[PDB]
Amino acid sequence: ESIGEIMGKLMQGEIGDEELSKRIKEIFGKRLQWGYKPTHQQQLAFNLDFIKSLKEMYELPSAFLEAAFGKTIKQSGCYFKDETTTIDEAEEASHELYCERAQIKDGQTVLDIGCGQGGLVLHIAQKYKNCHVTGLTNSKAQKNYILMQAEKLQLSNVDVILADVTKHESDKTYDRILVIETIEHMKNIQLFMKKLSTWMTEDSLLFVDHICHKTFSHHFEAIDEDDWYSGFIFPKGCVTILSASALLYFQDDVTILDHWVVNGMHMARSVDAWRKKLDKNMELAREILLPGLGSKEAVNGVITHIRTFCMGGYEQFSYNNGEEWMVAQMLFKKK
């Protein structure tokens, strides 16, 4: 059975959830076989080879995003205390977790790199009125969304830089730099960390959160021709999953102070909530998308892609009860 055939059934909604989950789980299982080595000697050889290789290197309407994601449209792993924690609660708990671990205090200048729909920017600005909070995003629609939300919430301490972070040049420095699940998109990590350090003083802290595997790194791409999923979700070679310790090898310009991981069931519950909410709001979602997409068929395609991303994310992050893929967090100061 070919890719084309599976992709055919998928688009027609002819693959039931149980089969879909089973297929994607199998794909991730093969990644685990690829990544785990027989000895720690071989594991480190494989991991260092990956790290060395690194060193040589239409937007959805906001009404749709609001129908699929939680209240602040957080697009990153959330934190669920209880089985009954709602996605809105989990967003807030995640925001609070970042503020604790990044040691945010009232009065600081704060920069949020790849701020998305600005949930974290708005959270910090509201909770700490004397902080000035800057979000940086490459999306004009995101910038406009954040500035509108700041206005509605009577926040006067928010600004947004519209920039490709890899191209952004400034001599401005910040007390705190936050990077929440943005580094996975960075083509040049050593260069990224170097640039961040130039936006820091000796008093600054840098907090990074990234999806990881606990043991090994990999690009998010097909191992083989049986893998229809990876290239469906990310049709570009644009996402890297670092191991939980990979960034320890990128301390040319910054120095680690603390390091944590959050078990993958938190991420799994996040994507599950998004999937369920999208399913609940399916009719509304299709109506919102139709104008901008042009046909019900193109609508179905965008919906299939997002829903499959959630179904696949579930299998990835829940694997072995959250103990394979998870979220890594690190705190650094400038050299």
Next chain:
Amino acid sequence: ESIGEIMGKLMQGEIGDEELSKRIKEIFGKRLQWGYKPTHQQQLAFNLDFIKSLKEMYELPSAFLEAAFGKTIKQSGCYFKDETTTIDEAEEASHELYCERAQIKDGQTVLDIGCGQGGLVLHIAQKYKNCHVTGLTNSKAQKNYILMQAEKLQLSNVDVILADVTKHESDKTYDRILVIETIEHMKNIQLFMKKLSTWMTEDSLLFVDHICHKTFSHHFEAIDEDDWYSGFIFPKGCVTILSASALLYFQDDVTILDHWVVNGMHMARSVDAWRKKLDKNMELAREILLPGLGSKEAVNGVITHIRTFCMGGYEQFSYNNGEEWMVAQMLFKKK
């Protein structure tokens, strides 16, 4: 059964090898239970707590050493290609491995910190005639042994600094600094690495080899009152076993370039060879030691201590076919 009673039988040679091995293996088994956590989240919490805590912190005659150790009296893990590799061959292979991984080239200035009986110093000096090689040791007997060996081998490119490395002050810099199983004795690691960096230029490399556990760190000390072994071998709290990745968190002043581990069976074969050679030369050893120790009883005590160290080391490093305790190696440049 009390410590005193086991220590009593041990000293009298009333514990056979099989029972001795079994007892020590059990002790290490309990350390593994202590060190492995149920989730990577908890593992990292435990490991970072250890790293944070670190940041707040009569000699045997040479004739005896020659009867127990290999030809160059290497007192560190060796490297065995074959099951029939002799300890002398394994010493040389280990020396060569260090030269490759530390990128030693003819003409460099080289410093070997805690050089022991100087096997590595002599190896480099002989193989690279244009290198100047300095060993640093806190032992007058070691210094004298190395200088005598250099004279006999017609080596003109060797010097030895007699110093406590933690107290040594100098503005001299070196192209290469080697630290072979010395860091385990360092009370202040952040301070040690800082000092080393002041002896480096922008062109220098630092190579560190240390016994490790692949997953977690621990001091070499008793967990409980059932552990008669740890405090017998090291009656002081003077030895730390870092995890294979612990030094990645000590990059304030140096930056990692490469990282390896050597499976623990190499160390196990090393201590096995020492134990067997001592056993072979037992009568001679007792004769050599008697003058300086004063009684056959004090002789037996020193021999029991060394032999047990080997028997225990065997169980530690061979555990799970070398995949628990092993040797970590790292290459750094100066910030």
